[PDB]
Structure formats: structure tokens, C-alpha cells
């Protein structure tokens, strides 16, 4: 996360993050719900086994609302290809039950139009992880959230020298720097309406973090939803 | 009718049913007796900040 400020006390629940055999925090993910989380099927290559941790703001300072567990069934989109990150997503099954209690939460899963309609055509949106901090830097020790302006379709596929498939979408800023960054793949992109939140993209790619001229490329989740959907009953 | 004017009124989700308008909300609410409002059934309602 480049940039952006910090993620407070309960001030994002939904924040998941993905722990390899020797306990680092790789990736990211979405509490969608008390079993199943959501996060990019490019993650599911960064680790041979990995674990869930959830609850944890601080990577050093132990607090006490942490807790591992373990992934029952990965869940990876047939479709998906390194080759172009397309289909960016996964779901995973946990074996033992999320306990929602302050710093854990599960985010609201919208509706594909309503979302659409009202949540992307928003002004911006949030992206949060334990990601590096400045594309040279080091992962950080500490949750952070950063707020992205939604980026205009056109200008995206412009600003890109990649094919912006209907499966992903912009977020971020042209000269500003921030960003996401290393290891904030499969983090949750959020917006707010009303105080609640709404799962509204997880987190991909980008060229590089912060660059100039480049966005920060999101797998569209609003058009995941059928699929994550009849995912959370497992196929 | 209108979900357009101000999502119409709803907390949640919209829907223009035919001519005017009907709110829902996500797993884990439910409708106000307005049925515009959405209301949680737990502690931990999904999209709500843990404060
Ligand atoms: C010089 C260093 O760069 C690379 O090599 C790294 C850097 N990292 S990151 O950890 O820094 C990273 C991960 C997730 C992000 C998510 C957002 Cl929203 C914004 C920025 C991000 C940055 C990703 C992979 N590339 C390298 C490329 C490989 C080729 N790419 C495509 C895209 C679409 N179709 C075909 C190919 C884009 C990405
Ligand atoms: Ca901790």
C-alpha cells in the first residue's frame, strides 16, 4: 500500500491475509462470509500450502482478536490464465468457522446492477493490505487502507499496455503516489454507501506500484457474482 | 418510482419493479417496516465497520 494511511481498529474487519509454511503474510483476501473468504486465483501460485489469518492489524505486536485457519478446498476459476490475469479470483472454504468479533467482519456482497449502477459510479472506493510500501520497499508490518478514485474505462485501457478484459477494472491515481503494491494481490477493494461497505473488486495487478501514468488493475468482482455465488455451496 | 433520484430512498439495494420502486437489502438484514431500511439479525452485520 503505497501511500494511503492506516487501517484503525475495526475500521477494516473484512481484511484477510494469506500465510505461507513459514508464516508470512503473502497475499490478501475478503471475509465474505464465517466460511468462505475471496481472493485472486494468481495468489493460489505463491506458496506450495498456505493458511488464512484473520484479525490482525499488526505483523509484530501480537494484539488478541488474530486467529489462523485453514483452507478446507481451494477454489480457483476454471477460466483464469498468468498469461493475462484474467479471471482474477478464487474463492476458499475454511474448515473451522470465522468468529466475528471486533477486527472481524464479513463485507456485503451487492447486487451485479444495483453495484454497478450505484457503487462504481462512485467517486472511489477502498483498497487495504499489508502490501509493500513503495514498490522498492519492504512488506509492511502494518494494515493500511487506501483510498482509490474509480478510473474512467477509456482512459484505463488507454493509461494500460495490457488488454483491460471485462473481468477487471481501474482504480487509483495518474501522477499521485498510491497504489497497491507487492503482495496486496487478493486484497479487498471496498465502497461505502451508507456506512456499510460492498465487496467491489479484489486485487490483481498493475505496472509496477505508484508509477506515473499507470492505474492499479482490479478483478471486477460485480461480474463474479453468480459464479462466487454458487461458489459459496462450492463448484 | 426512480432508483435514480436518490437510489430511492432505499439503505441498501434498488429495484424499479415495473412502475415504482422496491429496496432489499444483503444476507444478514432485513427490511424495515418503511421498506426502505435495512436492518442487521447480528452482531456482526456484513459491510459494517467493527467500532
Ligand atoms: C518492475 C516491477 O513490476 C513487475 O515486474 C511486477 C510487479 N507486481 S506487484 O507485486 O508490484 C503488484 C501486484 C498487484 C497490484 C495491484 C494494483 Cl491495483 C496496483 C499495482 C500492483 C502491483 C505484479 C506483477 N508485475 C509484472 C506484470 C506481468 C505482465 N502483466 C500482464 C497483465 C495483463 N495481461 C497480460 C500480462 C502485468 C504485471
Ligand atoms: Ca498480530
Given at each position: 500500500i503505497v501511500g494511503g494511511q492506516e487501517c484503525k481498529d475495526g475500521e477494516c474487519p473484512w481484511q484477510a491475509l494469506l500465510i505461507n509454511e513459514e508464516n508470512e503474510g503473502f497475499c490478501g483476501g475478503t471475509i465474505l462470509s464465517e466460511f468462505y473468504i475471496l481472493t485472486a486465483?494468481?495468489?493460489?501460485?505463491?506458496?506450495?500450502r498456505f493458511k488464512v489469518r484473520v484479525?490482525?492489524?499488526?505483523?509484530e505486536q501480537e494484539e488478541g482478536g488474530e486467529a489462523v485457519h485453514e483452507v478446507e478446498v481451494v477454489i480457483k476459476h476454471n477460466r483464469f490464465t498468468k498469461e493475462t490475469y484474467d479471471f482474477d479470483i478464487a474463492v476458499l472454504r475454511l474448515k473451522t468457522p470465522i468468529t466475528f468479533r471486533m477486527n472481524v467482519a464479513p463485507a456485503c456482497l451487492p447486487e451485479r446492477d444495483w453495484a454497478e449502477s450505484t457503487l462504481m459510479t462512485q467517486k472511489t472506493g477502498i483498497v487495504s493490505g499489508f502490501?509493500?510500501?513503495?514498490?522498492?520497499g519492504r512488506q509492511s508490518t502494518r494494515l493500511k487502507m487506501l483510498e482509490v478514485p474509480y478510473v474512467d474505462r477509456n482512459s484505463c485501457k488507454l493509461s494500460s499496455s495490457f488488454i483491460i478484459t471485462q473481468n477487471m477494472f481501474c482504480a487509483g491515481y495518474?501522477?499521485?503516489?498510491?497504489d497497491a503494491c507487492q503482495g496486496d494481490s487478493g486484497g479487498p477493494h471496498v465502497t461505502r454507501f451508507k456506512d456499510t461497505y460492498f465487496?467491489?473488486?479484489?486485487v490483481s495487478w498493475g505496472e509496477?506500484?505508484?508509477?506515473?501514468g499507470k492505474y492499479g488493475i482490479y478483478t471486477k468482482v460485480t461480474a463474479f457474482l453468480k459464479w462466487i455465488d454458487r461458489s459459496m455451496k462450492t463448484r | 418510482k426512480l432508483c435514480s433520484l436518490d437510489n430511492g430512498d432505499c439503505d441498501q439495494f434498488c429495484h424499479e419493479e415495473q412502475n415504482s420502486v422496491v429496496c432489499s437489502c444483503a444476507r444478514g438484514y432485513t427490511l424495515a417496516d418503511n421498506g426502505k431500511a435495512c436492518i442487521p439479525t447480528g452482531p456482526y452485520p456484513c459491510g459494517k465497520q467493527t467500532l
Open positions: 486465483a494468481h495468489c493460489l501460485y505463491q506458496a506450495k484479525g490482525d492489524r499488526n505483523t502490501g509493500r510500501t513503495h514498490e522498492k495518474d501522477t499521485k503516489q498510491e465487496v467491489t473488486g479484489i509496477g506500484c505508484a508509477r506515473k | -
